[PDB]
């Protein structure tokens, strides 16, 4: 152990953390490698998602080469503070941290080559702008943009270590409301006023499951429409009964359209759900206007009034049924 300690001290002696490898020379190739642990949350209201991952970085610092020893050296996490590490950050993160219990969750593994393996366990909540136009038959593209803060392409280069196999754990992701249909890795160089920087983009495509919404929105709407149509099977002389059917179904439809809109962000466009609820509103308000009209002609034109009821009993459900078939097909 003493020999190893001496070698480590020699490696540290004169090591300047301020200077990258090949300070004046070519850029440092940094290899990125990600193992996803989980996506803990996806907020449509805040348009972000919370990710948990093992973020590994590989580079070569010749100042950390050792000839004598024949094995790879795993050192205590506290060595990071006395080494140069890339200034890698997540461009589109809102709040991220590195886990601290029981010790700071960071790994350093050295090789006689001078190659460094720097692992971090990170949880990020990153921005994911959402196109809720087709909601809840939508899908989203959430990304994690990885870039260096200060060092330009003249000083740092990025690459996905292992190409398409550089990210793992997409298969582990378990979300109640979504499912990861595919993922993509990209490598680019982006140009700011301060210079050109390297970027890597991890992407997911989230397909939303409809299960939650058929229970909490669609069935209530569909059954509140069917409920409104019961008033067609009462004689027009039951004025108070048929107004209850009309008013209650009309009011319980607005409160659905409001309560459904309360779980979303305050977007200015209309969602596929908003149209569905809107049409449902039409069928319920029409069911009332129909009764109001029938009542208005019950002595003026009693023949017509009785015919309207007998037609409505068949037109309404058929139209509502065919509307559904068109609606679902348009969005599937």
């Amino acid at each position: 152990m003493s020999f190893v300690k001496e070698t480590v001290d020699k490696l540290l002696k004169g090591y300047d953390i301020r200077l990258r490898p090949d300070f004046g020379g070519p850029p440092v190739c940094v290899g990125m490698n990600i193992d996803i642990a989980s996506i803990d949350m996806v907020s449509e209201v805040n348009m972000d998602y919370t990710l948990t991952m093992y973020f590994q970085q590989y580079w070569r610092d010749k100042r950390l080469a050792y000839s004598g020893i024949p094995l790879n050296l795993t050192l205590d996490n506290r060595v990071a503070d006395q080494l140069w590490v890339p200034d890698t950050y997540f461009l589109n993160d809102k709040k991220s941290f590195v886990h601290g219990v029981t010790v700071k969750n960071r790994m350093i593994r050295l090789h006689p080559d001078g190659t460094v393996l720097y692992g971090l366990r990170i949880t990020t909540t990153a921005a994911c702008m959402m196109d809720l136009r087709r909601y809840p038959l939508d899908e989203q593209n959430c990304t994690l943009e990885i870039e260096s803060y200060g060092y330009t392409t003249d000083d740092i280069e990025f690459y996905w270590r292992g190409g398409d196999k550089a990210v793992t754990g997409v298969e582990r992701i378990e979300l109640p409301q979504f499912s990861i249909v595919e993922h993509r890795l990209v490598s680019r160089n982006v140009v700011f006023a301060t210079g050109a920087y390297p970027r890597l983009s991890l992407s997911f495509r989230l397909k939303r499951n409809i299960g939650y919404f058929v229970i909490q929105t669609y069935l209530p709407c569909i059954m509140t429409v069917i409920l409104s149509q019961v008033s067609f099977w009462l004689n027009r002389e039951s004025v108070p009964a048929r107004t209850v059917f009309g008013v209650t179904t009309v009011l319980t439809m607005t409160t659905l359209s409001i309560s459904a809109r309360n779980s979303l962000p305050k977007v200015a466009y209309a969602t596929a759900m908003d149209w569905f609820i809107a049409v449902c509103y039409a069928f319920v308000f029409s069911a009332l206007i129909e009764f109001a009209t029938v009542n208005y002609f019950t002595k003026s034109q009693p023949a017509r009034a009785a015919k309207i009821d007998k037609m409505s009993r068949i037109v309404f459900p058929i139209l509502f049924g065919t509307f559904n078939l068109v609606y679902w097909a348009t969005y599937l």
Partner: nanobody
Amino acid sequence: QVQLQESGGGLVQAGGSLRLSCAASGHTFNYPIMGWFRQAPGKEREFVGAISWSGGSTSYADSVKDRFTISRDNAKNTVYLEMNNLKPEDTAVYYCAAKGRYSGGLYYPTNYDYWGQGTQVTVSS
């Protein structure tokens, strides 16, 4: 615990197709990820592919990539493996495995807790 049982293995001619099935019972929720491994007579256990609990995300070996597809149907607690454009290299006993939620990497057989008595697939050229 979990019990896995396979089916659909048989003799197929080269360039042919075949569909393997793996029916699961018991605590399927505690072992969400499912994997496919194959064992040739001479070679070591090879990773074929694996699928998520949601069924959306998959992962395949390079050799098997673009010629095989893994699908799920949680309604029937069954994962399927469709093997198209089969080669004689694919000849092996195909196994079906289930992995714990926090069991580490997909590629490694050690991590999988439950397996099923494999089905033979032979490919004549």
